[PDB]
C-alpha cells in the first residue's frame, strides 16, 4: 500500500505512417506545489524504444534503473546485442507489464502509468500502455491522466482507426501532439509549459527533442471578460 | 458477493 508523493502528469502518444511519437512535460509536482521543473519523464531504451512514465517519480526512477540494467544484462554473452538480439519494444514492455502486475498482486504497486512507444525490428510500430494495476491495452493513440480525457479526443480526430495510420505523416502527427500539449497546459493544473518530445521512426530512427515550449497561446480574449454575471466594469 |  502506497500513496504517490512527487508526481508527473500526462504522457501522450500516437502512431503515424512510419513510426510513433511520444511526449510528456518536464514537471515533478508535489501535490499542488509545482516543485521540480527539470524532470525528464521520457526514457529511451536503445535506439528503437522510448518509455514514457507518469505518476510517482520515485517509482519512475526505480523503473529507469531497471531498464538501464536490462540493457546491460542483454549485452552479456551476446555478440548480436547491437543487431539481431537487441532489445525490442515488445520485450521491454512485456518485462515492465510483468513487473507492474506482480507488484500489484503483492499489494505494493509501482504507482505509475507507462506508455512504451517504439519500432520493432520488422518496421512495425509498437505502442502499448501499462499501469499500477497491471492493466494493458494498445491503440493508435494512447494517453495517461488528463491526457486520456483531453489529448485522446484531439489525437483521435487525426487517427480514428487502424486504416488512418498510413495516411498520417510525421508532420501532421507531431502538430497534433504539440497542439494537445498546449491544451493540457491550458486546462491541467499540474502541468508545465516545458516538455520533451520523442519520435521513433523506422527510417530516420530515434529523434529525442528536449526543452520544447508551448507557444501560440490565446489569452487576449481575457481582457474583455469582466465580473461573474452582472458587473459591467 | 459470491455466487450461491
Amino acid at each position: 500500500t502506497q500513496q504517490p508523493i512527487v508526481t508527473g502528469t500526462s504522457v501522450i502518444s500516437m502512431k503515424y505512417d512510419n513510426g510513433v511519437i511520444i511526449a510528456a512535460d518536464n514537471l515533478g509536482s508535489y501535490g499542488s506545489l509545482l516543485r521540480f521543473n527539470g524532470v525528464e519523464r521520457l526514457i529511451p531504451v536503445g535506439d528503437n524504444t522510448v518509455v514514457g512514465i507518469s505518476g510517482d517519480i520515485s517509482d519512475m526512477q526505480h523503473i529507469e534503473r531497471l531498464l538501464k540494467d536490462l540493457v546491460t544484462e542483454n549485452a552479456y554473452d551476446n555478440p548480436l546485442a547491437d543487431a539481431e538480439e537487441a532489445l525490442e519494444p515488445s520485450y521491454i514492455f512485456e518485462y515492465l507489464a510483468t513487473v507492474m502486475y506482480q507488484r500489484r498482486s503483492k499489494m505494493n504497486p509501482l504507482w505509475n502509468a507507462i506508455i512504451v512507444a517504439g519500432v520493432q525490428s520488422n518496421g512495425d510500430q509498437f505502442l502499448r500502455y501499462v499501469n499500477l494495476l497491471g492493466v494493458t491495452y494498445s491503440s493508435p493513440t494512447l494517453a495517461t491522466g488528463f491526457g486520456a480525457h483531453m489529448a485522446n479526443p484531439l489525437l483521435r480526430k487525426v487517427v480514428d482507426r487502424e486504416s488512418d495510420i498510413p495516411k498520417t505523416t510525421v508532420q501532421v502527427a507531431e502538430e497534433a501532439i504539440v497542439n494537445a500539449m498546449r491544451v493540457l497546459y491550458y486546462r491541467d493544473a499540474r502541468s508545465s509549459r516545458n516538455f520533451s518530445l520523442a519520435i521513433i521512426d523506422k527510417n530516420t530512427g530515434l529523434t529525442f527533442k528536449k526543452n520544447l515550449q508551448v507557444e501560440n497561446m490565446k489569452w487576449d480574449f481575457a481582457k474583455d471578460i469582466k465580473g461573474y454575471g452582472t458587473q459591467k466594469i | 458477493x459470491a455466487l450461491f
Binding site: 502506497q2 492493466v135 491503440s139 486520456a148 485522446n152 482507426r161 | 459470491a2
Partner: protein
C-alpha cells in the same frame, strides 16, 4: 487506500451448436467513462480447439488466459502430446481460479469448443471456479441484457406451440452456424444501444472440427 481491482467493462457471449461452437466478445476496453481502446481482443485461441475469454478486470483476465495457455503447453509435454479435451480444460481452469480463492481473479470466464463426441460445448465459470456446461451463456457488463434474450431465442423458453393452449412447449433443436451468428450480432447491437461500456467492434471466434475461424463486425462507437 490502494484498490487492486478495476472494471474494464465489455461483454462476452458463448453459444454451442451441434457440430460447432461460437465465442463472441466486443472489442471495446474502458475505465470509468473513458475509452482505452476500440480494438483490444479478449477472445483467444488457446490451442487444441479451445477458445477462451475472461471478461471483467482485464489484468486478471489476461493473467488467467496466459496461465491456461501455458497449462495447455505443459499438458503436451507431460502427457505425450495428448489433446486436451474441453472437459479436462474446464476442470483445469477451476483449479486455476480456485487457487486464488482468497484473492480472486475478478473475471467471468467462458470457454468454447468441441467435446469428445464432436459436439459443440460451452463452459462458463464464476470468479472463484464454480463451472457448468451449457448450450448458452452471456458474461460481463451486458450479460443481464443479453442472457434473457438467449433463453428465449436459443433455448425457446416461454415459447409454446401456437393453438395448443400453452400445453405443448416449442421443441428444442440445434441452430445452424448462420442462425447463431445472427443471434450474436443482434445481441451485441442491442447491448450496444442500451449499455455504455459495450460497442466499437464485435469479434466472433467459431470452432469446428476443421479449426478456429474468426469474424469481425463493426459496432456503434458512441
Amino acid at each position: 487506500q490502494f484498490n487492486p481491482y478495476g472494471d474494464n467493462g465489455g461483454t462476452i457471449l458463448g453459444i454451442a451448436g451441434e457440430d460447432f461452437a461460437v465465442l463472441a466478445g466486443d472489442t471495446r476496453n474502458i475505465t470509468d467513462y473513458s475509452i482505452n481502446s476500440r480494438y483490444e481482443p479478449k477472445v483467444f485461441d488457446c490451442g487444441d480447439n479451445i477458445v477462451m475469454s475472461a471478461n471483467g478486470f482485464a489484468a486478471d483476465g489476461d493473467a488467467l488466459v496466459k496461465r491456461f495457455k501455458n497449462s495447455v503447453k505443459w499438458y503436451h509435454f507431460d502427457h505425450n502430446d495428448k489433446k486436451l479435451s474441453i472437459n479436462s480444460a474446464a476442470r483445469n481452469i477451476q483449479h486455476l481460479l480456485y487457487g486464488k480463492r482468497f484473492f480472486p481473479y475478478y473475471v467471468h470466464t467462458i470457454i468454447a469448443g468441441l467435446d469428445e463426441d464432436g459436439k459443440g460445448a460451452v463452459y462458463s465459470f464464476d470468479p472463484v471456479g464454480s463451472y457448468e456446461r451449457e448450450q448458452c451463456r452471456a458474461g460481463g457488463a451486458a450479460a443481464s441484457l443479453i442472457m434473457p434474450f438467449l433463453d428465449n431465442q436459443v433455448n425457446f423458453k416461454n415459447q409454446y406451440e401456437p393453438g395448443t393452449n400453452g400445453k405443448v412447449k416449442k421443441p428444442l433443436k440445434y441452430l445452424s452456424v448462420e442462425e447463431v451468428i445472427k443471434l450474436v450480432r443482434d445481441s451485441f447491437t442491442s447491448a450496444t444501444e442500451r449499455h455504455i461500456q459495450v460497442g466499437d467492434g464485435l469479434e466472433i471466434l467459431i470452432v469446428t472440427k476443421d479449426g478456429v475461424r474468426k469474424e469481425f463486425y463493426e459496432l456503434k462507437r458512441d
